[PDB]
Amino acid sequence: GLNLIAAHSHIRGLGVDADTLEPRPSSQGLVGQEKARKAAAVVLEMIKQGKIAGRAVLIAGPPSTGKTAIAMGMAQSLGQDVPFTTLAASEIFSLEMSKTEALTQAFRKSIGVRIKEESEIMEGEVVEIQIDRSTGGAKQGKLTIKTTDMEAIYDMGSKMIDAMTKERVMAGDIISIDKSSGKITKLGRSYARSRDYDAMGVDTKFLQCPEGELQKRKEVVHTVSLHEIDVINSRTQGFLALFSGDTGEIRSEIRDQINTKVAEWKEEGKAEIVPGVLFIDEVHMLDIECFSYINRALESDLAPIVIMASNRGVSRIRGTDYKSPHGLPLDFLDRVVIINTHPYTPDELRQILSIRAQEEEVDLTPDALALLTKIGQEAGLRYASNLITTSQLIAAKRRAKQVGVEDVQRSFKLFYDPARSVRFVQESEKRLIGNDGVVDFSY
Amino acid sequence: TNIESAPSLAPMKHYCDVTGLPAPYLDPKTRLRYHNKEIFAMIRNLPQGMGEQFLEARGAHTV
Numbered sequence: 001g002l003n004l005i006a007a008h009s010h011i012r013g014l015g016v017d018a019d020t021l022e023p024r025p026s027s028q029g030l031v032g033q034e035k036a037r038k039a040a041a042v043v044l045e046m047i048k049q050g051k052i053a054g055r056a057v058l059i060a061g062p063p064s065t066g067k068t069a070i071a072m073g074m075a076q077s078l079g080q081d082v083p084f085t086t087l088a089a090s091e092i093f094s095l096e097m098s099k100t101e102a103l104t105q106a107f108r109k110s111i112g113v114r115i116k117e118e119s120e121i122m123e124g125e126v127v128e129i130q131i132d133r134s135t136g137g138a139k140q141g142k143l144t145i146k147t148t149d150m151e152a153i154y155d156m157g158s159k160m161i162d163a164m165t166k167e168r169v170m171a172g173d174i175i176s177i178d179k180s181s182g183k184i185t186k187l188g189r190s191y192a193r194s195r196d197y198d199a200m201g202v203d204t205k206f207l208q209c210p211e212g213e214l215q216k217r218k219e220v221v222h223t224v225s226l227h228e229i230d231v232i233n234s235r236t237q238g239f240l241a242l243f244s245g246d247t248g249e250i251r252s253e254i255r256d257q258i259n260t261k262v263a264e265w266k267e268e269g270k271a272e273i274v275p276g277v278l279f280i281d282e283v284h285m286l287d288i289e290c291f292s293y294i295n296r297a298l299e300s301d302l303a304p305i306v307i308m309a310s311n312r313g314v315s316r317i318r319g320t321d322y323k324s325p326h327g328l329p330l331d332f333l334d335r336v337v338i339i340n341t342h343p344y345t346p347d348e349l350r351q352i353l354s355i356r357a358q359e360e361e362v363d364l365t366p367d368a369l370a371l372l373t374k375i376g377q378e379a380g381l382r383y384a385s386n387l388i389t390t391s392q393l394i395a396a397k398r399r400a401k402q403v404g405v406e407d408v409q410r411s412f413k414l415f416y417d418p419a420r421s422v423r424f425v426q427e428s429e430k431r432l433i434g435n436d437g438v439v440d441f442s443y
Numbered sequence: 444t445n446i447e448s449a450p451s452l453a454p455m456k457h458y459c460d461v462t463g464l465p466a467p468y469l470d471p472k473t474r475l476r477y478h479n480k481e482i483f484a485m486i487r488n489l490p491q492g493m494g495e496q497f498l499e500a501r502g503a504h505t506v
């Protein structure tokens with residue numbers, strides 16, 4: 001389909017026992033990180049219960065130790081039933097709006113309002129339409145429609161005749177009508193009428209006739225975030241700004257009205273509130289002004305849970321000239337708990353490479369897997385996973401059925417790992433452009 | 444003068460010819476109003492002349 005194989009495609013969840021939250025050594029695509037996966041499992045319980053507002057959790061660890069993997073696992077284990085917002089900290093630096101506006105919007109995307117609405121919907125195959133136009137049109141008309149179980153004629157009101165003529169409804173069309181509003185959606189064409197569709201090209205698909213009652217009270221569940229209600233209320237077609245993105249700095253009195261309105265809907269039972277989670281990857285790319293904002297945005301009943309990932313050691317905080325753990329100010333780290341991820345052992349590297357090799361279409365000989373595991377220990381898990389794809393393509397070019405050691409060795413030779421590439425720049429130092437801008441082009 | 448009422452101009456509610464329950468549907472073939480797929484099935488399996496017998500209770504028989 002459209003969804004190609006990405007770096008995280010093998011992650012289907014957290015791999016955790018729902019009863020005890022004990023992580024299994026491998027499941028759902030996650031290997032090891034058990035203490036970290038247990039802690040991420042405790043955070044899901046908090047998210048799903050909704051009781052607690054504005055906890056901030058930091059996932060701290062070296063690069064390529066599964067900080068994003070665990071973040072993908074949580075998203076997959078919440079599923080579509082909860083707002084999950086994934087923010088790269090680089091995105092907050094909009095030109096359309098201030099940083100704190102962008103952080104408010106991100107927080108507001110992560111609280112959902114869940115609303116349940118019924119409609120009667122009428123669905124069936126059209127047996128007939130007749131319309132009498134006299135000559136101004138739409139003077140009267142009759143619809144005959146059926147399922148496999150029922151058939152009916154309807155006398156049509158003139159605006160339904162306009163809807164029918166707009167959507168060019170003809171005999172054999174399978175249509176649905178949202179009769180509370182009168183939009184027609186043409187679900188398809190009946191196979192039993194295929195010869196009538198003389199204009200439809202051979203690529204045309206045909207459906208079977210619908211079934212059961214012609215009319216059903218379908219119930220729809222909507223979730224709309226607080227940010228969507230804010231943007232709707234910003235201008236005459238404000239909802240369009242949910243797509244073009246040209247929301248200005250939406251005025252805070254609009255948001256306060258909406259916060260009041262939603263608390264009203266909660267007490268009346270007209271709506272339910274669904275606290276989601278905001279994930280901020282590379283939280284160290286935020287600056288000191290962002291952190292002092294987030295401090296107080298967390299202290300609100302309409303705050304999501306926030307989850308953050310950092311690779312950084314004791315490092316300079318952006319927007320200041322001093323250094324702090326994770327690159328984050330201690331004022332902020334006081335309101336955070338840290339989950340730390342460790343480096344993998346070789347048997348975990350083997351399993352992760354195997355899962356990555358099964359997610360990709362790669363038949364891998366045992367010695368190639370052993371070799372890739374050695375490379376993983378020495379060059380890093382990402383480099384070895386990148387070599388899987390390469391060796392498959394090399395094996396394929398020589399028409400081989402399996403990736404052998406021979407193919408991994410071509411890959412290792414053709415594509416340098418980070419450490420080999422660092423040596424290359426150190427040995428090539430006069431030929432590369434140095435930090436002083438000096439370079440020599442001569443042989 | 445023994446001439447003393449007139450038809451309503453309010454639109455008319457639709458009731459099932461079989462069971463009198465509210466009827467969303469009017470059968471094209473037999474002109475009976477029916478409540479649901481169960482009664483449509485029964486309506487289409489009526490004996491000869493029973494469809495007219497149901498219209499007679501509504502005063503709508505073919506004559």
Ligand SMILES: Nc1ncnc2c1ncn2[C@@H]1O[C@H](COP(=O)(O)OP(=O)(O)O)[C@@H](O)[C@H]1O
Binds near residue numbers: 011
């Ligand atoms: N414990 C794990 N189980 C399965 N796959 C993992 C695990 N840890 C990392 N990976 C995979 O290896 C790659 C590197 O880890 P990732 O989490 O992206 O790095 P980082 O921790 O720097 O964000 C990713 O493709 C990720 O899906």
